[PDB]
Amino acid sequence: ATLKDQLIYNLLKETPQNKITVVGVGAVGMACAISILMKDLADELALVDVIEDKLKGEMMDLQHGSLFLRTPKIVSGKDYNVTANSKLVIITAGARQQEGESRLNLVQRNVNIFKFIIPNVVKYSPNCKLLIVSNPVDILTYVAWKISGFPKNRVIGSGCNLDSARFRYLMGERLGVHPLSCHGWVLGEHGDSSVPVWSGMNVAGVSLKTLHPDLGTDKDKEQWKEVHKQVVESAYEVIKLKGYTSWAIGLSVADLAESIMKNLRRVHPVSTMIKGLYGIKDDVFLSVPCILGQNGISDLVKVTLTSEEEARLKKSADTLWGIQKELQF
Amino acid sequence: ATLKDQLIYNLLKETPQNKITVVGVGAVGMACAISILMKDLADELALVDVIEDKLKGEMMDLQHGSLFLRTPKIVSGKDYNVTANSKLVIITAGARQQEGESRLNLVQRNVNIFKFIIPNVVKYSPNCKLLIVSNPVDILTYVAWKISGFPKNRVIGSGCNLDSARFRYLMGERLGVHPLSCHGWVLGEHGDSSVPVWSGMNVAGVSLKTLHPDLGTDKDKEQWKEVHKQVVESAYEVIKLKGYTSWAIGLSVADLAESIMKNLRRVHPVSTMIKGLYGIKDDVFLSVPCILGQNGISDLVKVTLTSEEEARLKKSADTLWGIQKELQF
Amino acid sequence: ATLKDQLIYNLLKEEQTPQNKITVVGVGAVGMACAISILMKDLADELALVDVIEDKLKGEMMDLQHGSLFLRTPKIVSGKDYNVTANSKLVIITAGARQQEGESRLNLVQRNVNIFKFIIPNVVKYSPNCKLLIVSNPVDILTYVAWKISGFPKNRVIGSGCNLDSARFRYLMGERLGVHPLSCHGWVLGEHGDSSVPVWSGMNVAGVSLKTLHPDLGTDKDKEQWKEVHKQVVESAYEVIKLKGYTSWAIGLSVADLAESIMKNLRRVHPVSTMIKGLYGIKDDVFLSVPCILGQNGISDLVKVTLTSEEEARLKKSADTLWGIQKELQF
Amino acid sequence: ATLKDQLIYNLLKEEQTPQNKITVVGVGAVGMACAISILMKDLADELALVDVIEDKLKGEMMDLQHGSLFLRTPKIVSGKDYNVTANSKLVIITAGARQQEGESRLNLVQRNVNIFKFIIPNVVKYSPNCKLLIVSNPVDILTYVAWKISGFPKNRVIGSGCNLDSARFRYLMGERLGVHPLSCHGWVLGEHGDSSVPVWSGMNVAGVSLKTLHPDLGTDKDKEQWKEVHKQVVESAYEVIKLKGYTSWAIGLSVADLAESIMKNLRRVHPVSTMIKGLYGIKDDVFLSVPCILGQNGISDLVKVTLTSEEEARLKKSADTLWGIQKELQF
Ligand SMILES: O=C(O)c1csc(-n2nc(-c3ccc(F)cc3)cc2C(F)(F)F)n1
Ligand SMILES: O=C(O)c1csc(-n2nc(-c3ccc(F)cc3)cc2C(F)(F)F)n1
Ligand SMILES: O=C(O)c1csc(-n2nc(-c3ccc(F)cc3)cc2C(F)(F)F)n1
Ligand SMILES: O=C(O)c1csc(-n2nc(-c3ccc(F)cc3)cc2C(F)(F)F)n1
Ligand SMILES: O=C(O)c1csc(-n2nc(-c3ccc(F)cc3)cc2C(F)(F)F)n1
Ligand SMILES: O=C(O)c1csc(-n2nc(-c3ccc(F)cc3)cc2C(F)(F)F)n1
Ligand SMILES: O=C(O)c1csc(-n2nc(-c3ccc(F)cc3)cc2C(F)(F)F)n1
């Protein structure tokens, strides 16, 4: 005789079918959350962090916008049981490099955090895809793969996905064309060591390198190499200006989530286990174009690289392995 | 010739059709911006604020996500020339009240702030609609109206649009129905003095007040009055938990922008000049259900209120006019 | 080494079942309008089409496939054999005879019950866990039939019902008031057909009761003749059939609206055909439209609408008409 | 007072001109597929439909209006009189004569000229600043016809051209490679249909040239017969026509993609038909497809694709063939 019962005759006393979890509710985690919500990718969104008030506040702020969304359940908690049955778990938590801190010790601190996060995630969603966004993303994708025990197709790092998107943005600005119609790939290690593959840059299938052979070289009077320099530094420039980056990474991560959740088999440059390619013999993750879908990475595109490009990926792999073999799991 | 000229033959060396400006790039302003971008409402987005570094960093972060959007131009600056020819200008900038500072003094500081912002907006977009999101929104909508010289249809306050969305969310939680199918209106002055119109709360046209006469009274065993208390205290609780609120207000503003930009003539509870209704005789703005379209507010719905509800709106109007008549423009 | 081999290194060999497959049965105008609407709303990762006319079927499938670049549904299949429908979450039935000019939907019963005797066991055979969404006419009777033949629990057998009649009512309401239909609220319940019931006592804008403002609303004495709005709703399909030969776009959008609530588990309320036994003192197993909560398990709840004496009498008249047919069917 | 005036206080009497209006001319299968695709992509705040068959036109308009609840395009209008199209940003022409048994290409085009002599001036009268998007076949010649009659500058007269051929090519390429067509790049240029030119040099996934990986790509001696993909781009259209009677859905989706770039000023590149005199040794006023930057002023720029000698010869032969017909037309 409650109001609910006077109004509603229940037929069914009835698990989520398209659930995504975001771990970490810093600026990056919440940018991923809002972008996923506005793209209607999930029927349930779970948020996890260790700061309880901030977590609850973010969950409530999203819930209050429910009228404008098509995601009918948003939940959160410090307890990983709220993440149960996720198709996709996006990891954005972890430690930032501090003053005086080595890359090795920063990574070790993140190993120690992932040793708590990842087994809890795996416990409640043993068949999920893990999408690692935390930096340094290539090494932390390896760390998540090692700790989770997942097959390599289900452990994906966001890698050079945004680097590539920035590259196409800058390309489009130079040419006066939408980035959607400007094509070009940044591969390898995310960050300062990434590799712009000049041979693949094109508009409508017309090779810029063929039209303009000095493209990307020191002799280039248009200094197109400065485009890749800008890609590397634009992250730093945004951090210097507003303190951090968030929006572009959130959009780029939602794009990856779309391909996975909707089984699109679109090709994205993400970090994946690259052993066996380009002379690399160690268990390291680097960005190459991957086909993304329901089972994670199902296929790799084998981009033809020059000797110099290949040597740069090899050099990155050697460094990554050099750090990885010193980690304590 | 340059690479561009070898690649591209230009036919035309020829103004935005659907431009939106957001003034203020704090958390609320940026939530409005990302929500508008992800809803494909604008062909150009302009951001303005007085903090030049933050401003440029936010613009760049959004620009870097261009590949994932359908808004081909994002601009920013401290100079309002970047806002030229906007259809819709959303104001989120304003003062924060100081300890010991009277409400009157606070509003006067907002007046002085708007005496800079609004004339510069009007210079560059004389035919825009103004959407005021800054709190205290009902008074500041009056202030924008007076300073702009705009007809009242083109000056809209976000008002109780989000309070009503929160109400419907809470209603939906109690009933197990999506908020889209839970109907109910919070009207009047945004904040603690707002009015939940119990007579209008329904699912599928079934009045809850009819089924449950004690609805919203102190005699209510189900304590539905707590739902409106929760609405009123929501921003408070979220601010206490995470420091501020942003996502819900961004989504609600993007919903208002959708009706305006697409000429939908949907009904929203927004703040509008209410002189002539409910025995109100002064130039005050409060929320009532308004028809929103390409000319702003073209019509408003005359909601039948109980004597108590009417008295509350009247008391709010008296309080608003008491402050407004002391303002120096 | 083939070109594909040189270009792509494969990690995973095994293809998996789709997560969100939808089947549309029947590729007439209604079925194809449902298909394009569902495709453009991104509700499925696989769309299957089934019909008995093989050329037309293959042609429609290819036409949609050629638009794949512009869609986000990576697999579209078709076949006369129902094995192409396996593992569907939602199966939308649009097949069967349709109304000619001036013809009642009720005139289609014999033809479409006989088609359903073939279709429904084949659907259930390949997707035993699907939700059935019945669109073929007369939709209320055929929803009862699909429920009886399938042996499904009634929550998983949903008729498109009066979702469309209510959409038309709200459109006409919006035209009269100068308000978008989204903000005009009014329900048409009962048969999707001539005996439908407008619930005047529930109509409102912004929670303001129109019958309270206008006590003659929906009566013969009404100086504004709002009954004409419901009369236009009843006559809509006839008028469109007379003009263009059939209806398609509005029903396609109505069905996609229902599919969205089901596939995304929204628990939005829609007037759809379901068993109303136990409401308004009705004891028969009659199916007709009342507001239902719709989600991933189909109909999980009924909203109990308070009707005036006249509205309830009209709804019971509608139920008597439909039950007079449904009771005589033989399974 | 009326119920409306009791309920609603009016602030504004608005005589306001459409801000984002699209007109579709012709309400056959192609025109209505363009209409529904545009509606479900929210590209327009007003949609106008025009044709000469009045009952069919009214029926289509009503069927779309009845689905308004499910749309975000608040005004849908129609009429045989072109005053309903006034102030359109974009006018899509799908109307025209269909080729009859035994009829020459010249006679078919001339019948379309005669129809365009009615349609095009009426469009120009009411929307003198619109972009014209020609979809009627044969599209390259009728884009020329529309250009000559309208007297528009060539940036504002666009033929749908090889946009759909390229989409079909990418669908077929994706099927072969097991990759979404969004990630399979390849351009079909030149004359729409049988004489179109697949640009093998541009075919790629992730910037990896297939022709560089597989030098036989596109040739007769190719063991993998990739040339068959382009043969199927040509043949699959005829196959759809044979099987269901006509093509409609893929055209509609591809036209809505073009509309999206134009209405939202995206400056995306599309292979559309444009006046090509001065390129590739072409010296006549003919329209052929090349990659064009599309935005609010129509075609603002075009991409200069490097073609082999064989590819250039094929464009010239098409240009001679088209000009061969155009020079015989009576305007
Ligand atoms: O053994 C250790 O050092 C250890 C074990 S857990 C841990 N974690 N975990 C988080 C965390 C987890 C999830 C989030 F969503 C966000 C943050 C933060 C830390 C801390 F700051 F390093 F302490 N450290
Ligand atoms: O070719 C090799 O094996 C090789 C090439 S560089 C290298 N590096 N680099 C570092 C290092 C760098 C930065 C630090 F802050 C701290 C340590 C340490 C080593 C080493 F393995 F111990 F040798 N090894
Ligand atoms: O928005 C972006 O792309 C972004 C935001 S921070 C970032 N990071 N983070 C690291 C890093 C962090 C810790 C290490 F121990 C080592 C490296 C390097 C980069 C960069 F790509 F080079 F910029 N990138
Ligand atoms: O800042 C740091 O901690 C840091 C920065 S590079 C680094 N490296 N690098 C290598 C390496 C590199 C190349 C090789 F060919 C072989 C090994 C090994 C390490 C170390 F053990 F972690 F120290 N450490
Ligand atoms: O006393 C009352 O309020 C009352 C009780 S029944 C009633 N009804 N019922 C119908 C009706 C019923 C079924 C139809 F199929 C058609 C019409 C018409 C009326 C009315 F008189 F016009 F109001 N009114
Ligand atoms: O003098 C002539 O031959 C002539 C002059 S107008 C004409 N038109 N026009 C249309 C038409 C127009 C717009 C549509 F949207 C659809 C069709 C059809 C014909 C026709 F009768 F079939 F030939 N013919
Ligand atoms: O869906 C499509 O692509 C499509 C649908 S009809 C079509 N048409 N139309 C003609 C044509 C028509 C009249 C002529 F007088 C001459 C030619 C040729 C083609 C074709 F591309 F080769 F297939 N294409």
Side-chain angles (χ1 to χ4, degrees), chain A residues 1-12 15-77 79-95 97-145 147-217 220 222 224 227-228 230-239 241-280 282-307 309-329, chain B residues 1-12 15-77 79-95 97-98 100-102 104-217 220 222-224 226-228 230-239 241-280 282-307 309-313 316-327 329, chain C residues 1-12 17-220 222 224-282 284-316 318-331, chain D residues 1-12 17-79 81-97 99-100 102-147 149-222 224-230 232-282 284-309 311-316 318-329 331:
Chain A
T2 63
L3 166 57
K4 186 184 177 178
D5 289 350
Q6 288 189 251
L7 179 68
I8 301 180
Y9 179 64
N10 168 250
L11 302 184
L12 288 176
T15 61
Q17 300 301 310
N18 298 285
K19 175 174 179 174
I20 303 176
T21 290
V22 173
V23 180
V25 293
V28 174
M30 295 309 303
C32 297
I34 194 63
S35 304
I36 283 162
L37 290 169
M38 296 198 69
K39 285 173 61 64
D40 292 352
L41 298 183
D43 61 353
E44 179 164 331
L45 172 70
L47 308 176
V48 176
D49 200 303
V50 295
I51 298 171
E52 295 193 80
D53 281 353
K54 164 73 160 167
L55 179 61
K56 183 181 181 188
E58 292 292 0
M59 180 200 68
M60 290 176 60
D61 201 3
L62 295 176
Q63 284 169 338
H64 291 165
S66 284
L67 176 65
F68 313 109
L69 298 174
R70 302 293 157 132
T71 299
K73 194 179 188 182
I74 299 162
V75 298
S76 75
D79 191 311
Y80 280 79
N81 60 16
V82 303
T83 70
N85 307 303
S86 296
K87 294 291 188 286
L88 179 63
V89 181
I90 304 171
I91 309 295
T92 73
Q97 201 174 4
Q98 302 296 311
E99 50 162 10
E101 195 170 24
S102 68
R103 293 176 66 191
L104 176 54
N105 283 8
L106 176 281
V107 170
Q108 185 63 57
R109 288 205 293 134
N110 280 287
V111 165
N112 293 340
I113 295 164
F114 275 31
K115 276 175 76 172
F116 165 78
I117 294 173
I118 296 305
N120 276 296
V121 168
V122 164
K123 173 166 176 175
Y124 288 103
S125 300
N127 298 305
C128 73
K129 277 69 61 174
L130 289 169
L131 180 45
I132 308 309
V133 187
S134 317
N135 278 316
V137 62
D138 298 307
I139 300 182
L140 293 186
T141 303
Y142 167 88
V143 170
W145 170 75
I147 291 173
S148 67
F150 282 4
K152 68 194 181 178
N153 57 289
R154 289 201 279 127
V155 193
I156 306 152
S158 54
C160 292
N161 190 232
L162 179 50
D163 289 346
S164 285
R166 291 184 169 121
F167 190 91
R168 297 170 64 176
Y169 166 72
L170 294 169
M171 200 171 145
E173 285 298 293
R174 284 207 180 200
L175 295 179
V177 178
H178 197 279
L180 286 164
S181 297
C182 291
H183 301 285
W185 294 75
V186 175
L187 301 189
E189 185 182 359
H190 168 61
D192 303 21
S193 292
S194 68
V195 172
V197 189
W198 303 113
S199 69
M201 296 173 42
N202 74 94
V203 173
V206 186
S207 163
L208 274 48
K209 178 75 170 173
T210 290
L211 272 191
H212 178 49
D214 294 334
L215 184 78
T217 70
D220 186 7
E222 298 188 11
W224 277 86
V227 176
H228 180 250
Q230 285 185 257
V231 174
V232 171
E233 291 181 348
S234 63
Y236 292 108
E237 183 169 17
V238 175
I239 293 153
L241 288 165
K242 60 171 268 187
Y244 58 88
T245 90
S246 54
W247 305 119
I249 178 69
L251 290 168
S252 70
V253 163
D255 192 48
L256 299 179
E258 184 175 15
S259 291
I260 296 162
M261 292 301 285
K262 293 188 86 57
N263 198 27
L264 298 182
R265 301 184 59 82
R266 287 188 299 170
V267 174
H268 305 256
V270 287
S271 193
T272 191
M273 229 271 278
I274 200 171
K275 173 173 61 188
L277 302 173
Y278 307 116
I280 293 158
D282 299 301
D283 290 344
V284 302
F285 288 65
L286 291 177
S287 288
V288 296
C290 297
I291 302 184
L292 289 183
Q294 180 181 186
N295 302 125
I297 297 164
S298 64
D299 301 271
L300 264 48
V301 175
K302 300 186 273 169
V303 179
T304 305
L305 300 181
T306 66
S307 295
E309 295 171 330
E310 188 165 309
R312 291 168 70 179
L313 264 52
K314 185 55 166 64
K315 179 191 203 168
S316 285
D318 292 345
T319 297
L320 295 191
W321 183 248
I323 293 166
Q324 286 167 191
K325 73 178 176 177
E326 299 292 334
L327 295 173
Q328 172 67 63
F329 284 85
Chain B
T2 68
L3 175 51
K4 185 179 173 197
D5 289 338
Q6 296 177 234
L7 176 70
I8 294 178
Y9 173 75
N10 170 251
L11 280 71
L12 293 180
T15 83
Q17 294 305 303
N18 288 294
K19 182 170 175 168
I20 299 177
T21 291
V22 176
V23 178
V25 297
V28 172
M30 293 311 301
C32 293
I34 193 69
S35 298
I36 282 159
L37 289 170
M38 294 201 72
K39 283 173 61 62
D40 297 343
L41 296 180
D43 68 337
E44 180 165 324
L45 176 71
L47 309 175
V48 175
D49 204 330
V50 296
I51 303 182
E52 293 190 83
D53 280 357
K54 170 75 173 175
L55 180 64
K56 181 178 179 181
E58 292 297 354
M59 182 199 64
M60 287 178 62
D61 203 359
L62 295 176
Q63 284 168 340
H64 289 169
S66 286
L67 179 61
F68 309 113
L69 300 170
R70 297 293 198 274
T71 296
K73 194 172 183 178
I74 300 167
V75 295
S76 77
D79 196 307
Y80 279 78
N81 56 11
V82 305
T83 69
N85 303 303
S86 301
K87 297 278 192 293
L88 181 62
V89 177
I90 300 170
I91 310 300
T92 73
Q97 190 174 4
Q98 308 294 295
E101 180 185 30
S102 81
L104 174 54
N105 280 3
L106 178 277
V107 174
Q108 181 63 51
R109 294 201 288 116
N110 278 305
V111 169
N112 294 338
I113 290 173
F114 276 29
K115 284 174 60 171
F116 169 72
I117 297 173
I118 299 296
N120 282 304
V121 166
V122 168
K123 171 187 187 182
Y124 286 112
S125 303
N127 295 316
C128 71
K129 284 72 62 170
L130 282 176
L131 177 57
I132 308 304
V133 181
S134 308
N135 277 318
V137 64
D138 297 298
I139 294 187
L140 293 190
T141 305
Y142 169 79
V143 169
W145 173 66
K146 295 282 292 179
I147 298 175
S148 66
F150 282 2
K152 62 195 180 167
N153 55 286
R154 285 202 275 131
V155 190
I156 303 129
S158 54
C160 287
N161 194 59
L162 179 56
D163 306 301
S164 291
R166 293 184 167 120
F167 192 90
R168 293 170 70 175
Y169 163 71
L170 292 166
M171 179 170 170
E173 287 304 290
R174 282 201 182 202
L175 296 178
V177 178
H178 197 280
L180 287 161
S181 296
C182 292
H183 302 289
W185 295 76
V186 176
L187 297 185
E189 175 183 2
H190 167 69
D192 303 78
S193 289
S194 68
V195 179
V197 182
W198 303 111
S199 72
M201 286 165 55
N202 76 95
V203 175
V206 185
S207 162
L208 274 57
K209 185 73 168 163
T210 294
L211 290 176
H212 182 42
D214 286 333
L215 181 83
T217 77
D220 187 1
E222 299 188 20
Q223 291 290 287
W224 278 81
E226 290 298 319
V227 174
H228 180 249
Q230 282 176 269
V231 171
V232 155
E233 293 180 357
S234 278
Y236 296 116
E237 186 174 15
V238 174
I239 287 158
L241 290 170
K242 72 174 227 173
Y244 61 98
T245 88
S246 61
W247 304 116
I249 184 63
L251 293 162
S252 71
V253 166
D255 194 47
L256 300 180
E258 183 183 358
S259 295
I260 294 173
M261 296 295 290
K262 302 181 82 58
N263 200 31
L264 296 185
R265 297 183 62 79
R266 289 189 297 167
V267 179
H268 304 262
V270 285
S271 191
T272 191
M273 232 267 295
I274 211 64
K275 179 178 61 188
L277 303 171
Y278 305 112
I280 301 181
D282 305 303
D283 297 339
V284 290
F285 287 64
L286 291 167
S287 287
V288 296
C290 289
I291 302 182
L292 278 183
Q294 71 192 2
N295 296 127
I297 290 157
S298 59
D299 303 87
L300 60 84
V301 180
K302 297 180 276 170
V303 171
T304 301
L305 296 178
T306 65
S307 301
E309 291 165 347
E310 181 165 45
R312 280 210 247 171
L313 251 60
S316 287
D318 290 345
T319 299
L320 295 181
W321 187 246
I323 292 165
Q324 284 168 202
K325 75 179 191 177
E326 299 305 323
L327 294 173
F329 283 92
Chain C
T2 66
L3 171 53
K4 189 177 174 163
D5 289 340
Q6 298 177 53
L7 176 63
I8 304 183
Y9 171 81
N10 172 257
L11 282 72
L12 294 178
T17 59
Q19 295 280 17
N20 290 293
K21 177 178 183 165
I22 297 175
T23 290
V24 174
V25 177
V27 295
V30 172
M32 287 321 294
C34 293
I36 194 71
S37 297
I38 283 160
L39 288 166
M40 296 198 70
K41 283 172 71 66
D42 288 3
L43 298 179
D45 61 346
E46 176 174 339
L47 171 67
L49 309 174
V50 172
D51 208 333
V52 295
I53 305 184
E54 297 186 88
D55 287 347
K56 164 83 158 163
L57 179 63
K58 188 186 179 176
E60 297 289 0
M61 178 202 65
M62 291 174 60
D63 205 356
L64 292 179
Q65 281 168 343
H66 293 166
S68 288
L69 181 61
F70 310 109
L71 298 172
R72 289 127 316 264
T73 301
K75 183 181 218 179
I76 299 166
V77 296
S78 71
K80 174 183 199 130
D81 195 306
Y82 278 79
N83 61 4
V84 305
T85 70
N87 314 129
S88 297
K89 292 289 180 299
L90 177 66
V91 177
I92 303 176
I93 307 300
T94 74
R98 58 161 167 85
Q99 290 170 281
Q100 299 173 321
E101 177 177 344
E103 185 180 25
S104 174
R105 294 168 186 92
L106 297 177
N107 208 41
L108 301 166
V109 166
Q110 179 181 17
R111 273 168 284 180
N112 286 347
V113 169
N114 281 332
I115 287 170
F116 267 46
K117 287 179 175 179
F118 170 82
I119 291 181
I120 296 298
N122 277 306
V123 169
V124 164
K125 177 176 175 164
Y126 289 100
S127 296
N129 289 308
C130 71
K131 278 75 63 173
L132 288 173
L133 179 54
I134 307 305
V135 184
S136 311
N137 276 313
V139 63
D140 305 297
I141 291 161
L142 291 176
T143 300
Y144 167 81
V145 172
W147 171 66
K148 293 301 275 192
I149 294 170
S150 68
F152 280 1
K154 56 191 185 74
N155 57 287
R156 284 206 274 127
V157 190
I158 304 112
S160 53
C162 284
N163 202 59
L164 175 55
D165 307 76
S166 291
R168 288 175 165 138
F169 194 63
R170 295 169 66 180
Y171 166 73
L172 294 170
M173 175 169 178
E175 286 305 290
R176 283 205 179 199
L177 301 172
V179 175
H180 198 285
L182 283 164
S183 299
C184 293
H185 303 290
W187 292 74
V188 173
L189 301 182
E191 181 200 5
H192 170 64
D194 300 344
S195 72
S196 74
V197 182
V199 185
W200 308 107
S201 62
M203 298 174 36
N204 73 90
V205 172
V208 183
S209 166
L210 303 197
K211 189 142 178 79
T212 296
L213 292 178
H214 182 38
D216 291 339
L217 182 66
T219 72
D220 293 340
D222 185 2
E224 296 182 23
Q225 308 188 245
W226 280 82
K227 264 178 119 169
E228 291 304 312
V229 175
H230 178 249
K231 180 188 145 122
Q232 289 172 272
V233 167
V234 164
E235 296 184 342
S236 283
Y238 298 104
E239 293 289 357
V240 175
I241 289 162
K242 176 174 125 174
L243 289 169
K244 56 172 274 187
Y246 55 93
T247 85
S248 58
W249 304 115
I251 184 62
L253 289 163
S254 180
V255 170
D257 179 55
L258 300 175
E260 181 187 3
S261 287
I262 292 165
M263 299 292 292
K264 301 186 79 61
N265 194 29
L266 303 180
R267 297 181 62 78
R268 286 196 289 160
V269 177
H270 300 265
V272 287
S273 323
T274 195
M275 178 188 296
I276 60 171
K277 171 176 59 180
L279 300 180
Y280 313 108
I282 295 175
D284 314 291
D285 281 355
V286 64
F287 281 57
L288 59 63
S289 281
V290 294
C292 297
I293 300 178
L294 269 188
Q296 67 189 4
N297 302 124
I299 294 163
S300 57
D301 303 88
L302 269 49
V303 176
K304 294 183 281 173
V305 178
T306 311
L307 298 172
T308 66
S309 285
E310 183 180 344
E311 285 160 358
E312 179 173 342
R314 289 179 170 269
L315 186 64
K316 283 177 186 180
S318 193
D320 291 342
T321 295
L322 290 167
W323 181 243
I325 294 159
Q326 301 175 9
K327 79 182 184 179
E328 305 287 3
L329 296 175
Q330 299 184 235
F331 302 107
Chain D
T2 61
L3 168 54
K4 182 180 170 183
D5 288 338
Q6 289 179 248
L7 179 66
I8 298 167
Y9 172 70
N10 175 254
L11 278 82
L12 279 178
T17 83
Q19 296 300 302
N20 296 290
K21 180 168 179 177
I22 298 176
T23 292
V24 175
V25 177
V27 299
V30 173
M32 295 309 301
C34 296
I36 193 70
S37 299
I38 287 169
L39 292 169
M40 297 195 73
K41 285 170 63 61
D42 294 349
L43 301 180
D45 63 351
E46 179 170 337
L47 173 71
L49 306 175
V50 176
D51 207 314
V52 295
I53 303 175
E54 291 195 291
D55 282 352
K56 167 80 173 172
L57 180 63
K58 191 187 174 168
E60 293 295 357
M61 177 197 70
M62 290 180 44
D63 201 1
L64 294 175
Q65 288 167 337
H66 293 172
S68 285
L69 177 59
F70 311 116
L71 292 173
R72 299 290 156 118
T73 302
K75 196 178 180 172
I76 298 171
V77 299
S78 76
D81 193 314
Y82 279 74
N83 60 8
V84 305
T85 72
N87 301 291
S88 295
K89 288 196 162 165
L90 175 65
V91 178
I92 301 166
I93 311 294
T94 75
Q99 192 167 21
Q100 294 307 323
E103 186 178 30
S104 67
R105 288 192 70 191
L106 179 51
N107 281 336
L108 184 278
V109 171
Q110 183 64 60
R111 292 200 295 122
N112 282 291
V113 170
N114 295 344
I115 292 163
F116 273 37
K117 278 176 70 172
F118 171 69
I119 295 179
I120 296 294
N122 273 294
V123 168
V124 167
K125 172 182 186 182
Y126 288 104
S127 308
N129 305 118
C130 72
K131 279 68 62 178
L132 280 172
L133 174 51
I134 309 304
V135 187
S136 318
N137 289 306
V139 62
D140 300 305
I141 300 178
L142 297 192
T143 303
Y144 166 85
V145 170
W147 176 63
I149 292 171
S150 71
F152 280 5
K154 57 187 186 182
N155 60 289
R156 283 198 286 126
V157 190
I158 304 137
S160 57
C162 285
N163 197 51
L164 174 62
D165 311 56
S166 293
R168 289 180 172 126
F169 188 90
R170 297 169 68 180
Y171 166 71
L172 294 167
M173 173 181 174
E175 216 200 4
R176 278 215 183 187
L177 296 172
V179 174
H180 199 283
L182 284 161
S183 298
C184 291
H185 307 282
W187 295 77
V188 173
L189 306 184
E191 188 186 346
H192 169 69
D194 299 52
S195 297
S196 64
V197 180
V199 181
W200 302 110
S201 66
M203 183 167 326
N204 75 93
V205 173
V208 183
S209 168
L210 271 63
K211 179 75 173 178
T212 297
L213 271 179
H214 185 62
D216 283 340
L217 183 84
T219 73
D220 293 334
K221 72 139 94 181
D222 185 4
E224 306 196 13
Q225 296 283 288
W226 280 86
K227 194 171 180 177
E228 180 68 21
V229 172
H230 178 252
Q232 278 302 318
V233 161
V234 181
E235 293 174 351
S236 62
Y238 289 104
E239 183 173 8
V240 171
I241 293 162
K242 185 192 84 229
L243 293 169
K244 65 172 263 190
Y246 56 90
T247 76
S248 62
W249 304 117
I251 291 172
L253 288 164
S254 76
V255 165
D257 195 51
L258 297 178
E260 178 178 7
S261 292
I262 293 169
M263 299 296 292
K264 300 181 82 57
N265 197 28
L266 295 185
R267 296 182 63 81
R268 287 190 295 167
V269 180
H270 300 266
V272 285
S273 195
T274 192
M275 223 286 285
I276 212 61
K277 189 174 67 173
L279 301 179
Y280 309 108
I282 294 173
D284 282 302
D285 290 338
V286 297
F287 285 69
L288 291 169
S289 285
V290 296
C292 291
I293 302 178
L294 281 192
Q296 73 181 2
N297 297 126
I299 300 168
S300 64
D301 302 85
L302 60 83
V303 180
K304 286 179 286 171
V305 179
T306 309
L307 298 183
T308 64
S309 295
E311 285 163 343
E312 280 198 24
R314 293 169 72 171
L315 294 192
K316 283 185 238 287
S318 288
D320 294 335
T321 296
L322 302 180
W323 185 253
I325 287 169
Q326 293 170 195
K327 75 185 179 172
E328 304 292 344
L329 300 172
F331 285 82

